[PDB]
Amino acid sequence: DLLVPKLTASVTDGAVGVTVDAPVSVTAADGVLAAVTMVNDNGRPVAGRLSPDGLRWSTTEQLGYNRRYTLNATALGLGGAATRQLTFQTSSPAHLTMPYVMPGDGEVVGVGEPVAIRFDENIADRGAAEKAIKITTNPPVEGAFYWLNNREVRWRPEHFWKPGTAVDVAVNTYGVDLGEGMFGEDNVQTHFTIGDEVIATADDNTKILTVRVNGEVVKSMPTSMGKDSTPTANGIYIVGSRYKHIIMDSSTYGVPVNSPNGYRTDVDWATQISYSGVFVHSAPWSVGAQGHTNTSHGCLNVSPSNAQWFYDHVKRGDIVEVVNTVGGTLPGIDGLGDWNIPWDQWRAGNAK
Amino acid sequence: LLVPKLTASVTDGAVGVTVDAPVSVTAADGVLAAVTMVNDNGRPVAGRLSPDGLRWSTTEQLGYNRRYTLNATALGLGGAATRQLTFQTSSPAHLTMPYVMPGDGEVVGVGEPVAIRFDENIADRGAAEKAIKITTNPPVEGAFYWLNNREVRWRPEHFWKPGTAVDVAVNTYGVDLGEGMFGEDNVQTHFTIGDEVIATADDNTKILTVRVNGEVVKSMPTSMGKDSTPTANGIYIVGSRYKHIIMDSSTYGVPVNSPNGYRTDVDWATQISYSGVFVHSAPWSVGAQGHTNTSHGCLNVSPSNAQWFYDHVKRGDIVEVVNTVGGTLPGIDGLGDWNIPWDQWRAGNAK
Ligand SMILES: *CC(=O)[C@H]1O[C@@H]1c1ccccc1
């Protein structure tokens, strides 16, 4: 009279819709696992590993969608043996969606850079997407998720990041039902660091763009912003990509070139600060207007010299704030206007 | 013509007849004229003959440790038939009474498990599980798991969906629960799942955020257990609510006179673990709430936030703790059912 080994698996025989966001395990009690195999609906075996003590076996590669797996396990012991065969089917997505995360892995970014997770499909279950995203911060700081549209979600703290903060983003979305049968195509995993505090302020009262590094003025640039008919909106702008030169085409923003407010001109040293088309760029033609009157379509015109300096000394995530213009406020969902949404609204989020 | 034939759901001379079902008498090639059943004291058992005269059944429950005598007369085209049966019902060595939670008619949160607590150790856990019928609308899969030798729990893999109906039929009367132990009685309870309410206490931020149906409705600065007596991570099920309570550490195994012991009156206390973790009013730690941990394990919040928790949270709601320096709440705590992985829970420990 002795104990008979028992077998415990993380799946049920006959189970359907098994999610592939976790390994499949099989455990032996009152005995050890003598043989554990697992094959798919073809013949190919599934990779796995057994613990040295012989009690725990797990798969070591990710399991695929739309697969029927067959699991055979045998357990031995002083008091007998036990064998079990289990077959189960994994999730069968209706559609797949792949996430993309910014900033890039290893980047050093300014204090205003939000964590960004953009999917290539609409997300029916935003809560499920948020649950699947794990964000670590050192030093730890509370942030919250907020959706700019149906496909991109952002995560940021109440105030600007503290320089030196380490941020780690893991979007563990493979095998996760993101709503209406849409499952994540894969996981993504990026890490970045917050750099120096760089805040540039363009004051319409003075028509000056002052760059502050760690709270001290390092550059004062005369500027000409949008005229009354096409003014530059007030608010907080997040610096984005930087270009040695770029063709500013209004058609990419929905405004034809031939229309009154349209344009197509090649400019130098252009730093993007809004998705709606606001740049800090070289503007030789308005050097005389810079510091006095507004003549552009919204962009912050500066001298070629100050434009190259801005390009060289400003990095993705730095902040450009505009105040006292005749325009409104930059939309919070512009894509670089995250900080214009009041914190209570951002904190509460819009997972619905 | 044919002499009618009389058959019964019991047979003459039977012993150990279980009283979980009624006794019946059926006629073939004829009809029943009369059926009488009496116990050993000569008291008749209430019974009902079907309109067609073919089937007779007891209409009251039969007792343990009883000898019943059944007499049936039948008439057919070929003549009459008569029969007399005698049988003896189960003679339990012991009886056990079940207790079922939550209460009948209640509205509970999405983490509320079905509970059946017997007042004796159950030697045949499989027999008790087989005798408990759970109905859910909308239907959802669930499984049994035993916290101790006397209490068994039933829950789904994921939290309940709001609006779900749950019907529990503990049909243990007349059932052998092992080693001659039989159910003292049956129990029936029905309850409903209300709004989804999930409160997350994050130790990295030291905020207790209450979400009702996915919407942030309250943010409470909190002070959890200090390093020496930390608040454990994991999922807590909300239990009882107290306008005021005497926190006594001996109730949870720690002598009051010991270093980690305590005995203080506390306002607006919501229990979330049998181990003694509460959400309660802590005016003495208002400065530390949202900054540092200073408690014995409880979630300290301000008086206004404690009372708010008392009013808007109900039995079955969820409090989840994360990023603390403690361990994970035991799955068999009594309110930590969800800390058991579904595979371990579904497999069960019925043996
Ligand atoms: C965003 C802007 O207002 C600048 O790109 C605008 C432009 C530059 C040069 C000529 C015409 C328009």
Residue numbers in the entry:
A (entry chain A): 56 to 407
B (entry chain B): 57 to 407
Copied sentences from the primary study:
The L,D-transpeptidase LdtMt2 of Mycobacterium tuberculosis, which is a target for TB treatment, is amenable to covalent inhibition via reaction with its catalytic cysteine. We report αβ,α′β′-diepoxyketones (DEKs) as a new type of mechanism-based inhibitors of nucleophilic cysteine enzymes. Studies with the l,d-transpeptidase LdtMt2 from Mycobacterium tuberculosis and the main protease from SARS-CoV-2 (Mpro) reveal that following epoxide ring opening by a nucleophilic cysteine, further reactions can occur, leading to irreversible alkylation. Here, we describe the identification of the small molecule trans,trans αβ,α′β′-diepoxyketone (DEK) 1, and the potency and mechanism of 1 and related DEKs 4–12 for LdtMt2 and SARS-CoV-2 Mpro inhibition; the results reveal DEKs as a mechanistically interesting class of electrophile.
DEK 1 exhibited potent inhibition of LdtMt2, with a pIC50 of 7.2 ± 0.1, with 30 min pre-incubation. The results reveal that 1 covalently reacts with LdtMt2, giving an initial adduct with a +267 Da mass shift relative to unmodified LdtMt2 (ESI†), corresponding to addition of one molecule of 1 to LdtMt2, which has a single cysteine (Cys354). This adduct was transient, converting within 2 h into one with a mass shift of +160 Da relative to unmodified LdtMt2, provisionally assigned as 3. We proposed the reaction involves nucleophilic attack of Cys354 on the carbonyl-group adjacent carbon of one of the symmetrical epoxides, with ring opening to form 2, followed by retro-aldol fragmentation, releasing benzaldehyde. As reported, LdtMt2 crystallised with two molecules (chains A and B) in the asymmetric unit. While this structure manifested clear additional electron density at the chain A active site, only partial density was observed at that of chain B, thus inhibitor modelling was only performed in chain A. The additional electron density in chain A supports the proposed structure of adduct 3. The carbonyl of 3 projects into the proposed oxyanion hole, formed by the backbone NH groups of His352, Gly353 and Cys354 (distances of 3.0 Å, 3.4 Å and 3.2 Å, respectively). Extensive hydrophobic interactions of 3 with active site residues Tyr318, His352, Trp340, Thr320, and Met303 were observed. To investigate whether the DEKs react selectively with Cys-354 of LdtMt2, we performed protein-observed SPE-MS assays with LdtMt2 that had been preincubated with ebselen, which is known to selectively and irreversibly react with Cys354.16 When 1 and 4–10 were combined with the LdtMt2-ebselen complex, no reaction was observed, evidencing that inhibition arises from at least partially, selective reaction with Cys354 (ESI†). The combined results of the reaction of DEKs with GSH, cysteine, LdtMt2 and SARS-CoV-2 Mpro, imply a conserved reaction mechanism, involving epoxide opening followed by retro-aldol reaction.
